[PDB]
Amino acid sequence: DIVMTQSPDSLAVSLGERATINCKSSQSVLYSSNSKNYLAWYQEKPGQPPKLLIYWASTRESGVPDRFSGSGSGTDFTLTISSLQAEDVAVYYCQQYYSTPYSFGQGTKLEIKR
């Protein structure tokens, strides 16, 4: 059973500043056979379903802005936004697709400090 835990639960930074959200999996999601991390990051904008941002722990999905980047390996991971944009207000989720059933973290609410 893999449980995903995020930290913090919510945070706020001024526009243009960096934001950092962490995620921890109960078990390792690094597959030894291919040395890849089965971890993903989702962005859930207000009233919208979560959409894929990063997969394989650090591979950015197409169309996704350059300011988003994932890092980490094993059990500790980090989603970083280099420079916060207004449209980034959302709840960010981390997911392990290492073993079924695929599980999500409980989300970290990102807001901008006005």
Summarize as ranges the residues that interact with Zn ion (CB under 5 A): 14, 17
CA 25 to chain centre: 12
Helix (H, G, I), strand (E, B) or coil at 86: helix
Name which position in 14, 33, 35, 100 contacts its own copies (CB under 8 A).
Answer: 100
Task: Name the minimum Å distance from CB 56 to its own copies.
Answer: 7
Check binding of 93 to its own copies (CB under 8 A). yes
Q: DSSP label at 97? A: -
Helices and strands counted in the chain (H then E): 0, 13
Q: Which residues bind its own copies (CB under 8 A)?
A: 3-4, 38, 40, 44, 49-52, 55-56, 93, 95, 97, 100-107
